[PDB]
């Protein structure tokens, strides 16, 4: 049997990797960060409340100027907010009301959105006539779009529910690279600060590190027990954090190739929907299904605070590039800024 | 003068929220529905009775606008994209009653069980279309297909007294099609604290009364939603 022979040779390769990872596990992260000072209680107040959307907010994304943010809601609207003055800059009606992700271009000239329509629609904000129009639609994917992120004005990376991630040329509208290897719906992706790599977590309880230029899977990270819903890179780009349905957040190191820390509590029995780091990476903010976001000490694995101002499931959350505020959207149709 | 830029911001925000309340009136007036069903169930025949990753069908019954969404070009792993439909008025779950000999009926009983007990779909009512009743009748009328093989509790099942048989139909078809309904109603009544309900209907794919069944069931769902806001029920 050639099939079983390939199955047993994969088992020995998994045992070789598992023992090579254990040889590097000399000390735990809790043993290294034992004597550092705890952060203390993190008391954060709601500074702004954005009350424009009609349905549940599924995604949001900050602009690189740390003042404007885009918000996607399943009533079919993309609202650009001025977070300082709470004013609405733009309101884009979408063709599909089932948007599940939205991105803000680093240049600030474009926004993207996608969902169950399996299409990533690029919207040009800086149009000559002055009002936003759809400039491009990317229709290669065969499953729902879970996440999309801009590399530059002409490149965008999208993860989809067809267990595949893809890289797109925007002016030509064609897939330039496809990333295969996941066996479940890829739920999120996170670009590295250098944007040479990105990490994606799927519904196979696994996360994979991809090389953008070569389109290959570099490393595979296991340890979770259920589907990974959210993922976020560490500020330096040498680690990332995953949130899963097993009610646990975990921190994985790229160079160690294994998980370093686990963020769990016996009272927490709901899955994580969003994760984000602070500007320094000391705090790990995670949105949960129990309607409140918890702040974790990323080094001590101790809960440092709670953001309990939302009346429904916290679906998205993001920290500004300058680190000044945190914006959390939720299914209660509101978006709150915390500081 | 920086005050000019902020006055231009207030006038731009003023134009947007003028449009956002025009869209609020349209959004609240429309009633969204999720048409869910497996293959070989007659689901696609109902939308013709009235690639892309989701198909939208707009219809209007008694000046009330309904927006029905049919999931297409998606994998059979539904546990993620099914959460997007927690705010719909009802989920139209289409089942093939003739498919019990595989055992597609047990596959649909487990899918209905997962939808009923999902934490995000616990307030979403389900409109159950026990489709393919015309094909079930021909299958039951013959002695070749015995539902006792795939469901051994059918050997002691008796038709309930409240069962209303269609005019001029076999009791063996009445007992068969009502047994299948009780298999779904046993799951529906096992859990649920009055938050959501199940509305079973004996359906054919070519039936014209299908849009009126959804209209009358959605009118019940909205009515119970109003009664719950006043703590009356």
């Amino acid at each position, epitope marked *: 049997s050639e099939l079983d022979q390939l199955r047993q040779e994969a088992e020995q390769l998994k045992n070789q990797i598992r023992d090579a990872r254990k040889a590097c596990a000399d000390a735990t992260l809790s043993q290294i960060t034992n004597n550092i000072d705890p952060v203390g209680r993190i008391q954060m107040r709601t500074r702004r409340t954005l009350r424009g959307h009609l349905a549940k907010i599924y995604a949001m994304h900050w602009g690189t100027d740390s003042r404007l943010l885009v918000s996607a809601s399943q009533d079919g609207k993309l609202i650009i907010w001025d977070s300082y003055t709470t004013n609405k800059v733009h309101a884009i009606p979408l063709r599909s009301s089932w948007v599940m992700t939205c991105a803000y271009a680093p240049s600030g000239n474009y926004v993207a959105c996608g969902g169950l329509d399996n299409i990533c629609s690029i919207y040009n904000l800086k149009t000559r006539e002055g009002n936003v129009r759809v400039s491009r639609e990317l229709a290669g994917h065969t499953g729902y779009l879970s996440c999309c992120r801009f590399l530059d004005d002409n490149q965008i990376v999208t993860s989809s529910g067809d267990t595949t991630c893809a890289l797109w040329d925007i002016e030509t509208g064609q897939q330039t690279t496809t990333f295969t290897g996941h066996t479940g719906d890829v739920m999120s992706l996170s670009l590295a600060p250098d944007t040479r790599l990105f990490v994606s977590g799927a519904c196979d309880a696994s996360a994979k590190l991809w090389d953008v230029r070569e389109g290959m899977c570099r490393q595979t990270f296991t*340890g979770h027990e259920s589907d990974i819903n959210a993922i976020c890179f560490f500020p330096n780009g040498n680690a990332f954090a995953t949130g899963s349905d097993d009610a646990t957040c975990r921190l994985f190191d790229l160079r160690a190739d294994q998980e370093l820390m686990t963020y769990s509590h016996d009272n927490i029995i709901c899955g994580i929907t969003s994760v984000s780091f602070s500007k320094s990476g000391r705090l790990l903010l995670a949105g949960y299904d129990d309607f409140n976001c918890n702040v974790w000490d990323a080094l001590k694995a101790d809960r440092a605070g709670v953001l309990a101002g939302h009346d429904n499931r916290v679906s998205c959350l993001g920290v500004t590039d300058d680190g000044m505020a945190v914006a959390t959207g939720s299914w209660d149709s509101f978006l709150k800024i915390w500081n | 003068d920086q005050r000019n830029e902020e006055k231009a911001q207030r006038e731009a925000n003023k134009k947007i929220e003028k449009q956002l309340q025009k869209d609020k009136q349209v959004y609240r007036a429309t009633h969204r529905l999720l048409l869910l069903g497996a293959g070989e169930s007659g689901k696609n025949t109902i939308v013709k009775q009235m690639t892309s990753g989701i198909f939208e069908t707009k219809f209007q019954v008694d000046k009330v606008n309904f927006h029905m969404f049919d999931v297409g070009a998606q994998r059979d*792993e539904r546990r993620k994209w099914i959460q997007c439909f927690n705010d719909v008025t009802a989920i139209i779950f289409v089942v093939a009653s003739s498919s019990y000999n595989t*055992n597609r009926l047990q*596959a649909a009983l*487990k899918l209905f069980d*997962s939808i009923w007990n999902n934490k995000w779909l616990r307030d979403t009512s389900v409109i159950l279309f026990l489709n393919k009743q015309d094909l079930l009748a021909e299958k039951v009328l013959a002695g070749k297909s015995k539902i006792e093989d795939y469901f051994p509790e059918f050997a002691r099942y008796t038709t309930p007294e409240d069962a209303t048989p269609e005019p001029g139909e076999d009791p063996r078809v009445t007992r068969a099609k009502y047994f299948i309904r009780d298999e779904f109603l046993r799951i529906s009544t096992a859990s649920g604290d009055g938050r959501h309900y199940c509305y079973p209907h004996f359906t054919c794919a070519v039936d014209t009364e299908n849009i009126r069944r959804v209209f009358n069931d959605c009118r019940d769902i909205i009515q119970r939603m109003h009664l719950r806001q006043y703590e009356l029920l």
Partner: nanobody
Framework: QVQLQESGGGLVQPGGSLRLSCAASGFTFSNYKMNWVRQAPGKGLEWVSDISQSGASISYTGSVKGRFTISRDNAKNTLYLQMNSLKPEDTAVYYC?????????????????????RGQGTQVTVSS
């Protein structure tokens, strides 16, 4: 690393008995509902039996009621399936399937064609 390994199987005479075992690793066995599914030659995945987190609620597919018995040992992290009065229609590859999320009443996508939290299966052949 969630791993499910099934042991047992083999060629049985009609009316014989067999006991399938499922060794689970990589997760908390007691927090999840366990399932049994099979795939007959030239057919799709078919759900057989399930057992709750504790072991109180037990459900069977109609074809196997009275002949099959599902059991879980939360201490040893094992799932059992005592198969009695085996018919030639029982010949299939029996997979040990795990529910996708813990502490949930719903069990989604267990009989999918590509499901992660499912073992590779054991071949059970009932013949003479």
């Amino acid at each position: 690393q969630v791993q499910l390994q099934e042991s047992g199987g083999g060629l049985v005479q009609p009316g014989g008995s067999l006991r399938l075992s499922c060794a689970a690793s990589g997760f908390t066995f007691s927090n999840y509902k366990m399932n049994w599914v099979r795939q007959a030659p030239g057919k799709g995945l078919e759900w057989v039996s399930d057992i709750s987190q504790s072991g109180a609620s037990i459900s069977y597919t109609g074809s196997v009621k009275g002949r099959f018995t599902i059991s879980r040992d939360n201490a040893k992290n094992t799932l059992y399936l005592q198969m009695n009065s085996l018919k030639p229609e029982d010949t299939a590859v029996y997979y040990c399937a795990r529910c996708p999320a813990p502490f949930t009443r719903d069990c989604f996508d267990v009989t999918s064609t590509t499901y992660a939290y499912r073992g590779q299966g054991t071949q059970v052949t009932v013949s003479s």
